């Protein structure tokens, strides 16, 4: 889908997203994995308040990691990850967040695949 | 919260002073971690009272710190933690301070 297109567009000779690796993404992907587990536990059509706050914190973490790492900033701007966080936050639905997590999972999967 | 809009609108406030003030929040944060109470602790209350005293002297030390405090309403949020008397609200305030430090780093 979109994830395959962006990973193919960002591939370079193998250099992905200006030198992005799984180790650089590991902190954020672990945070997003924590977010997912809380959503998996939740049984409510609407996102909780706590998950909304920590998704805002995930947005803050995206900004911080992008500021520290040029590769993560390139990944965020090319893959629209932060904007998608804002989109799911304003939509406030569990299924949309699960779709966004699926999108990130596809991103990392194809990144490893072309690695 | 609204850290992004304020930090973008206001973009000699140096990251050094922010990091010192963040360290003072860190010290209160360790205390609230040791507290482990839903209600606001009295020792934590003393910690945040001396924190606002330290906010005042900082303002006296550097005008740039004062502009940051008045524009970000950190002192007003401290008043909010007192007028609410909970630990969840304090943890929210600590995150907001951290967000201001992060956004400041990002826009820098």
């Amino acid at each position: 889908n979109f994830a395959r297109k962006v990973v193919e567009e960002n591939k370079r000779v193998i250099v992905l997203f200006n030198g992005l690796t799984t180790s650089k993404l590991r902190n954020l992907l672990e945070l997003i994995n924590h977010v997912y587990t809380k959503v998996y536990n939740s049984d409510d059509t609407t996102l909780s308040e706590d998950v909304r706050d920590e998704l805002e914190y995930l947005k803050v973490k995206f900004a911080y990691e992008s500021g520290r790492e040029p590769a993560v900033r390139t990944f965020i701007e090319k893959t629209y990850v932060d904007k998608l966080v804002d989109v799911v936050l304003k939509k406030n639905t569990k299924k949309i967040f699960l779709d966004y997590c699926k999108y990130f999972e596809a991103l990392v999967a194809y990144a490893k695949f072309y690695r | 919260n609204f850290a992004r809009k304020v930090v973008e609108e206001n973009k000699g406030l140096t990251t050094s002073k922010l990091r010192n003030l963040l360290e003072l929040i860190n010290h209160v944060y360790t205390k609230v971690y040791n507290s482990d109470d839903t209600t606001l602790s009295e020792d934590v209350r003393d910690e945040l009272e001396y924190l606002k005293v330290k906010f005042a002297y900082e303002s006296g030390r550097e005008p740039a710190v004062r502009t940051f405090i008045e524009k970000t309403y950190v002192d007003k949020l401290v008043d909010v933690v007192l007028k609410k008397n909970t630990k969840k609200i304090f943890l929210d305030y600590c995150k907001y301070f951290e967000a201001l430090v992060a956004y400041a780093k990002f826009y820098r």
Binding site: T37, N41 | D36
Partner: protein
Amino acid sequence: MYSKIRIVGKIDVLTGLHIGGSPVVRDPYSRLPIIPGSSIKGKMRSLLAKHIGLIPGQKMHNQDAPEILRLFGSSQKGAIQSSRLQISDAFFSKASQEEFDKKDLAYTETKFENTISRLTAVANPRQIERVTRGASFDFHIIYNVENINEVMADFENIKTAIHLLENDYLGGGGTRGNGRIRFVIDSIDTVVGDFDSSNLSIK
């Protein structure tokens, strides 16, 4: 008159309990950790079989002592014995669920570990998911009274197995700290039959 003695209680994990399946085994409908009943049954059977004694050069689980084969079951050709013990899956208790919802605990922990290879003096990171220490699982076992005369010896063997299991661990990396558990028996009554189990106890 068929006699079934229901023994209900709790398993309090004195240390992190990791029954794999590194995700723990979870009940998909509730997505909460459980103790598989086969884990309790296998650990109890192994401990009690070692305590009673292992037939030298043993190969199968139908060669244990007749005490073990009666209570834990036998599938030997011709000599098939029904299993007295029916150890159900132990589900995460509601009380510990509330106590974990307070303090915002996750009901699980991801213990970080490593192994230092002798040749390289290098460490290989490893994450093991464990149930937190506070958790308690409500366990429910059923005893079938095939022989009324053997109930007392069987409950002595059950007590021995439980006592060994408390000083041992439930499934996981026990030798490295995981899996320590403690049984707290809440009730022992005959759900079915005229049997008088009021004089019985396993812990």
